[PDB]
Design an enzyme around this catalytic site. Structure first.
Site, short mmCIF file in Angstrom:
data_model
loop_
_atom_site.label_atom_id
_atom_site.label_comp_id
_atom_site.label_asym_id
_atom_site.label_seq_id
_atom_site.Cartn_x
_atom_site.Cartn_y
_atom_site.Cartn_z
N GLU A 36 0.81 -1.21 0.00
CA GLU A 36 0.00 0.00 0.00
C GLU A 36 0.85 1.26 0.00
O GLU A 36 0.42 2.29 -0.52
CB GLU A 36 -0.93 -0.01 1.20
N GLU A 84 -2.46 -7.65 -3.32
CA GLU A 84 -1.74 -6.41 -3.09
C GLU A 84 -0.24 -6.56 -3.27
O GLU A 84 0.40 -5.69 -3.84
CB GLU A 84 -2.10 -5.86 -1.71
N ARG A 118 -11.22 -8.32 -0.15
CA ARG A 118 -11.88 -7.36 0.73
C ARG A 118 -12.07 -5.99 0.08
O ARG A 118 -11.46 -5.69 -0.95
CB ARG A 118 -11.02 -7.14 1.97
N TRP A 160 -9.98 3.41 15.65
CA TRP A 160 -9.29 3.09 14.41
C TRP A 160 -10.18 3.14 13.17
O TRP A 160 -9.76 3.57 12.10
CB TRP A 160 -8.65 1.70 14.55
N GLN A 253 -1.35 2.83 10.52
CA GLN A 253 -1.18 3.01 9.10
C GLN A 253 -2.38 3.44 8.21
O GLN A 253 -2.29 4.44 7.49
CB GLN A 253 -0.50 1.75 8.53
N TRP A 303 4.18 0.84 25.24
CA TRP A 303 3.83 -0.52 25.62
C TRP A 303 5.09 -1.36 25.93
O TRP A 303 5.12 -2.11 26.92
CB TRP A 303 3.03 -1.14 24.48
N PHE A 356 -0.16 4.17 22.99
CA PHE A 356 0.64 3.00 22.61
C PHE A 356 1.95 3.51 22.02
O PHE A 356 3.04 2.99 22.30
CB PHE A 356 -0.15 2.22 21.55
N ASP A 365 -5.15 4.57 25.40
CA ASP A 365 -5.91 3.36 25.60
C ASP A 365 -5.78 2.86 27.04
O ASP A 365 -4.76 3.10 27.72
CB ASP A 365 -5.52 2.28 24.59
N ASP A 367 -5.49 -0.19 28.05
CA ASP A 367 -4.48 -1.23 28.21
C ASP A 367 -3.11 -0.64 28.55
O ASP A 367 -2.43 -1.13 29.45
CB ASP A 367 -4.36 -2.06 26.95
N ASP A 368 -2.72 0.39 27.81
CA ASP A 368 -1.45 1.07 28.04
C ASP A 368 -1.49 1.86 29.34
O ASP A 368 -0.55 1.81 30.14
CB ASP A 368 -1.14 2.02 26.88
N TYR A 411 -10.20 1.93 23.67
CA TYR A 411 -10.21 3.38 23.52
C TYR A 411 -11.48 4.13 23.99
O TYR A 411 -11.41 5.29 24.38
CB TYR A 411 -9.95 3.71 22.04
N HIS A 442 -6.02 -6.67 32.80
CA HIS A 442 -4.87 -5.80 33.01
C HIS A 442 -5.21 -4.61 33.88
O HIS A 442 -4.35 -4.06 34.54
CB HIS A 442 -4.32 -5.32 31.66
N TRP A 480 -6.42 -9.16 22.26
CA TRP A 480 -5.25 -8.50 21.69
C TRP A 480 -3.96 -9.30 21.72
O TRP A 480 -2.89 -8.76 21.47
CB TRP A 480 -5.02 -7.15 22.38
N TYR A 486 -3.18 -16.60 26.27
CA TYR A 486 -2.95 -15.19 26.57
C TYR A 486 -3.99 -14.69 27.54
O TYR A 486 -3.66 -14.20 28.62
CB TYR A 486 -3.02 -14.38 25.27
N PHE A 592 -6.90 -8.16 14.96
CA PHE A 592 -8.33 -8.44 14.94
C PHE A 592 -8.45 -9.94 14.82
O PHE A 592 -7.80 -10.55 13.96
CB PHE A 592 -8.98 -7.80 13.74
N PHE A 596 -6.26 -9.88 11.29
CA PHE A 596 -5.01 -9.12 11.32
C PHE A 596 -4.20 -9.56 12.51
O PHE A 596 -4.67 -9.46 13.64
CB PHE A 596 -5.32 -7.63 11.42
N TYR A 600 4.92 -9.03 18.15
CA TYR A 600 5.54 -8.13 19.11
C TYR A 600 6.93 -8.64 19.46
O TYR A 600 7.10 -9.58 20.25
CB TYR A 600 4.70 -8.01 20.39
C1 LIG Z 1 -1.67 -4.83 22.95
C2 LIG Z 1 -1.96 -3.82 23.78
C3 LIG Z 1 -1.96 -2.38 23.32
N1 LIG Z 1 -3.13 -2.05 22.49
C4 LIG Z 1 -4.04 -1.20 23.26
C5 LIG Z 1 -2.70 -1.35 21.28
C6 LIG Z 1 -2.41 -2.32 20.12
C7 LIG Z 1 -3.50 -2.20 19.04
C8 LIG Z 1 -3.20 -1.02 18.10
C9 LIG Z 1 -2.18 -1.42 17.02
C10 LIG Z 1 -2.94 -1.92 15.77
O1 LIG Z 1 -3.09 -0.82 14.84
C11 LIG Z 1 -3.91 -1.08 13.73
C12 LIG Z 1 -5.33 -1.21 13.87
C13 LIG Z 1 -6.14 -1.48 12.74
C14 LIG Z 1 -5.57 -1.63 11.45
C15 LIG Z 1 -6.52 -1.92 10.28
O2 LIG Z 1 -6.06 -2.68 9.27
C16 LIG Z 1 -7.95 -1.39 10.15
C17 LIG Z 1 -9.03 -2.31 10.07
C18 LIG Z 1 -10.37 -1.86 9.96
C19 LIG Z 1 -10.65 -0.48 9.90
BR1 LIG Z 1 -12.42 0.08 9.74
C20 LIG Z 1 -9.57 0.47 9.97
C21 LIG Z 1 -8.23 0.00 10.09
C22 LIG Z 1 -4.15 -1.50 11.31
F1 LIG Z 1 -3.55 -1.63 10.13
C23 LIG Z 1 -3.34 -1.23 12.46
#
Ligand SMILES: C=CCN(C)CCCCCCOc1ccc(C(=O)c2ccc(Br)cc2)c(F)c1
Ligand SMILES: C=CCN(C)CCCCCCOc1ccc(C(=O)c2ccc(Br)cc2)c(F)c1
Ligand SMILES: CCCCCCCCOCCOCCOCCOCCO
Ligand SMILES: CCCCCCCCOCCOCCOCCOCCO
Lengths: 619, 619
Positions: A36, A84, A118, A160, A253, A303, A356, A365, A367-368, A411, A442, A480, A486, A592, A596, A600
């Site tokens: 991308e 892609e 998708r 997000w 991203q 984190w 984060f 967030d 979690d952090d 969030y 947590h 997560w 986990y 997700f 996704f 780490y």
């Molecule tokens: C582990 C603990 C800490 N935690 C609180 C933070 C970690 C999570 C945040 C990092 C992930 O970031 C993202 C998120 C999403 C996307 C999507 O693809 C997405 C998919 C769908 C849509 Br609608 C928009 C973007 C992505 F590319 C990156």
């Protein structure tokens, strides 16, 4: 025995610490970030021959023997990811002939082609003119008019999702096309006889939306769309108000990229915002030693620094260790003190969470915030005024964020609307931010550090939530992090910290489950397939992190002095490297479920340490 | 005779050219810029001892015997400028005792104290808590709601006014106070018995606004101001949208500083706009050789490069001179190609103007656009494609800006509303942007080179405009340059270029006036007082620029071979410095008649060359 493991693990972690005093491991995802990027560069007409070369090296390096690319290492070929990556390469130089291009093309074909990918993939392709816009789910600028309490207003979506939707509404509004040169046109992505098997909206399609979409697509065709100019300017404005400090949006991203495309669509390349956005990209890139270059989906410094500290403390270092202090001071300057988007549901809540990444003030967030606060609560800093101070703001904010059911989301509060899950556009990953077992655990572990317990009403509401969510086999889902190993580790470790009785039935029913999934090699592992097919829950190749997680669930429930327990410690001890580190060729992180996954980098080093630190405690 | 002079002036200019290929002379104004910076720094809590030192040596170095500061050099002491410089110093370190603090304090008092200063001065003082906010004219966020065609909507004000008003409405909305330490409190600014002689609104007070303001200050006191949160965000977004490329706003000091203050008010010191906005400031600063530091009110690179070229061409150098080409190429990258604020009155007009400064796309002006296009017209660049093309785009943008009367304004079309001139807030300089004789003349002179005579209806509408504006004594007022010597030179030089007959009566009645004001020393000069009291029209110590201006009006009207004509050339030929330059200890530039004067550093060098270039032509 393990003591030399702990000593080596410690000194290693400390070697990784940056100067300013924080740890920062690269975040691993999949080749779509890079593919991308290649396309964003084309769109913004900013192509660097040298960069593309490093990119091409990476893209190939990551391709598998069969010629496909997956979401996680050792995962099934992914259509979107391969499509892609395929177009990305063909643009950089590769001819559809070359062995690699060959293999992938036949896989993409065997799947029904471009018509089975998708929305994002067909949309990206729409942007360079290789796919009709009319066939892409429509998201309109006008969505900007829905008020705070309306079906589908942008605040019903998770952080997000939201920012991406806004960025895109402007882009879909103009449906722009930046043609690829004939050299890279990819008509062959259509050349297949296989029936196109399309993925639908994450939660099932309501013929309503289907119709609403068709409606919007026809509307798009009119000669006049009243107040649309406004809708746009509302989106652009929403965007300019939030742009993060590093020039990104939300520090992830997707919206970042779309937001940049959006300003180009709007003729604003030479505007501070677009310039900061463009150059802020470099901080997320990474120069791979073998010649490649990869772009991080996001960055986890806060984190990493947070867990880093906790592991080194549980592991032994004095709460006043001059090296742990550099970290404490650093974490303190990180605390976010301004209303974020979370303010829309909690206006009288005092800002005090953490992000984060480095600079992302509008999106802290839970979690952090919990791991950072809890971590501080274990150090003795010079300005004890600030430590005391910081911890409270964060703490009161965590409590202020508790959702209705008693658990915490990431969030937002009660971001539980079920509506967004049906739009045609939403066919990839999560789109809302509802409370999860792990984030909740947590938080509880955090409160538990301060000593609050089962007696406080906030903590009981949570434990009630966890008890109700527990799976039949006494395991807890991992939102997560991959996955039941986990989550269960997280919960049992937390419940132990908030005073609950580790002997209870539901608790025991959980540890049994953990002892019961140990691989022959002593450790534990769980493959990312456990989100797709249950026959994989708790099953998978052993990893230093997932072993460490199961180890905490056991050490917590009393079974520290056990077979499976001491057997697992053996694994970590045996498999450690001569420098004290640990390898982990698998992903243990979750973006997700099912869609996704993340890698780490620090998990392999920090968790084994934190588990061994807690084992050396039970003795 | 003169040839050695010109020959030297030419080489001197050529030595001043920066590498990239442009010229850039520092813009001189008065100590309020520096005094306000000192205060901006206090507000934003970013004080650098080392700068305050340079700023102190500077403020002091600019003070005069009597202990005061003026608008122009050799001008009458100015109360506002002195009050502000007084507070600035007292904050940096100076004790009310010391000689300078004494002489100034006396001046201040003899004038009625702080109660006699303009709005800005009392407002700045209000900001640090040394003056009640209730006594400051109120401008509300809500002004943001007046539509495009409504009395007092922000588009009835001139470009510079507008942006300031928006920035301020947010500030006045919160009426913040950033207390000065006791050490610098200036109560003594009130200790006077003299009757406070207050300055009123530019055009005149209407008892209405006088009421309406009390109105506002009352509404300001309520517990609830409905939709104000949103009026504010309108102003906020309005700003975020137009922030200049360098992080400034409009490339001028006022709105830039207020916008920064406004962002701080909104806890946005972590946001990209504010960061870029804050670090952009260094570009406008200037390190003075005697250890001082001054901040430019604005920057004139495009403008300098423009005249520079024209002077060097009229003087002799080949239209394809490899040195002027660097300039031509540079100027081409400068052309603005996106809708500015001017688009609100001319939506179907194609962008093609230029700005005064480096990067300021939303505010191109007719004056710069005209000089830049015309100057390019006198060149032969290696890309006859882009050169041919830009000139055309700019041409059209100029043509499409021609106001109602035929004569051009600076930034907007028919920005002639008379309403804004009566608000209590507007007591300093111009606040609207109506057409002026000089800008109009520079436009006509531009078309002229192409070959466009009085046939074209365009031209005639303008000449009709000029003819009607001409003063009784055959002179033409100077809006952006001091003064009648400026205007008249501009007009007559233009009319000559658009084919008009230099022999006409009104033309002659102009040249006579020129000849009639020549100072015995051979040259011409006009003091900035000619804006305050008519006695000085065409009177003041002779300067290299003003002489060169009167010289063009004469060379234009045929009188090149005259006494006053050759006598004036003598002046320049002599007063010229050994290096080729010229000195000019006076201001020949106009910010706002009667209120704000500027010193254009390059004028002393460029105009004498351009006048001598045209004299060497008439022979
Ligand atoms: C582990 C603990 C800490 N935690 C609180 C933070 C970690 C999570 C945040 C990092 C992930 O970031 C993202 C998120 C999403 C996307 C999507 O693809 C997405 C998919 C769908 C849509 Br609608 C928009 C973007 C992505 F590319 C990156
Ligand atoms: C001759 C070349 C072309 N010409 C059109 C450009 C040169 C004029 C622009 C340079 C001066 O810019 C300004 C302008 C204003 C102010 C105000 O003080 C002001 C005072 C009151 C208010 Br309300 C707002 C700002 C200022 F400080 C600087
Ligand atoms: C601009 C009005 C000042 C009031 C600010 C309180 C805003 C509360 O936040 C509401 C939720 O929206 C998230 C905001 O973060 C964006 C920054 O907007 C800038 C200043 O509000
Ligand atoms: C953002 C919607 C795109 C439509 C904008 C074109 C509007 C024409 O300009 C109207 C006048 O306002 C001045 C604009 O310059 C400011 C930049 O705002 C960003 C994009 O227009």
């Amino acid at each position: 025995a393990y003591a030399r493991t702990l000593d080596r693990a410690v000194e290693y972690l400390l070697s990784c610490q940056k100067d300013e005093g924080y740890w920062w491991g690269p975040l691993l995802s999949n080749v779509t970030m890079e593919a991308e990027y290649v396309l964003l560069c084309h769109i913004l007409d900013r192509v660097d021959r040298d960069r593309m070369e490093k990119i091409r090296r990476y893209l190939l390096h990551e391709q598998r023997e069969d010629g496909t690319w997956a979401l996680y290492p050792g995962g099934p070929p992914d259509l979107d990811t391969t499509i892609e990556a395929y177009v990305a390469l063909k643009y950089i130089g590769m001819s559809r002939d070359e062995e690699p291009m060959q293999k992938a093309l036949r896989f993409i074909q065997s799947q029904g082609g471009i018509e089975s990918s998708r929305v994002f993939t067909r949309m990206w392709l729409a942007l360079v003119g290789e796919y009709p816009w009319e066939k892409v789910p429509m998201v309109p600028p006008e969505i900007m008019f829905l008020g705070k309490r309306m079906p589908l207003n942008i605040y019903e979506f998770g952080s997000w999702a939201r920012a991406t939707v806004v960025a895109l509404s402007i882009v879909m509004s103009r449906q722009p096309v930046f043609p690829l040169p004939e050299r890279a046109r990819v008509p062959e992505l259509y050349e297949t006889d296989v029936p196109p098997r399309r993925r639908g909206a994450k939660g099932g399609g309501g013929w309503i939306f289907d119709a609403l979409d068709r409606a919007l697509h026809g509307y798009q065709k009119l000669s006049v769309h009243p107040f649309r100019r406004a809708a746009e300017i509302r989106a652009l404005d929403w965007l300019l108000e939030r742009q993060a400090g590093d020039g990104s949006w939300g520090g992830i991203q997707p919206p970042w990229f779309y937001a940049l495309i959006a300003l180009k669509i709007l003729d604003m390349t030479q505007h501070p915002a677009f310039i900061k956005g463009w150059e802020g990209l470099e901080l997320y890139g990474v120069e791979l030693d073998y010649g490649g270059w990869m772009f991080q989906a996001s960055i986890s410094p806060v984190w990493d620094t947070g867990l880093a500290v906790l592991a080194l403390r549980a592991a032994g270092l004095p709460a006043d260790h001059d090296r742990l202090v550099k970290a404490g001071e650093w974490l303190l300057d990180r605390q976010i003190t301004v209303p974020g988007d979370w303010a829309v549901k909690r206006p009288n809540l005092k800002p005090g969470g953490f992000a984060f990444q480095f600079d992302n003030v509008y999106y802290p967030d839970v979690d952090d915030t919990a791991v950072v606060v809890w971590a501080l609560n274990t150090l003795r800093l010079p300005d004890e005024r600030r430590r005391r101070d910081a911890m409270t703001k964060g703490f009161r904010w965590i409590v202020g964020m508790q959702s209705s059911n008693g658990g915490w989301g990431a969030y937002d509060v009660d971001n539980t609307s079920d509506l967004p899950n049906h739009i045609p556009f939403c066919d990839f990953g999560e789109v809302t931010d509802p409370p999860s077992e792990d984030v909740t655990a947590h938080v509880l572990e955090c409160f538990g550090s301060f000593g609050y317990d089962d007696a406080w009403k906030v903590i009981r509401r949570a434990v009630e939530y966890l008890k109700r969510e527990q799976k039949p086999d006494g395991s807890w889902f991992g939102r997560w992090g991959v996955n039941y190993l986990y989550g269960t580790g997280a919960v049992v470790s937390a419940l132990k910290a908030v005073g609950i009785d580790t002997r209870e039935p539901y608790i025991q029913k959980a540890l049994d489950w953990v002892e019961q999934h140990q691989n022959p090699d002593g450790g534990w592992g769980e493959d990312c397939r456990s989100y797709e097919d249950p026959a994989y829950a708790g099953k998978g190749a052993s990893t230093p992190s997932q072993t460490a997680w199961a180890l905490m669930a056991l050490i917590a429930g009393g079974r520290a002095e056990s077979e499976a327990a001491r057997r697992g410690v053996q694994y970590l001890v045996e498999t450690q490297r001569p420098d004290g580190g640990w390898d982990e060729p698998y992903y243990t992180g979750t973006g997700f479920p099912g869609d996704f996954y993340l890698g780490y980098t620090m998990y392999r080093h920090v968790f084994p340490t934190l588990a061994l630190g807690r084992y050396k405690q039970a003795i």
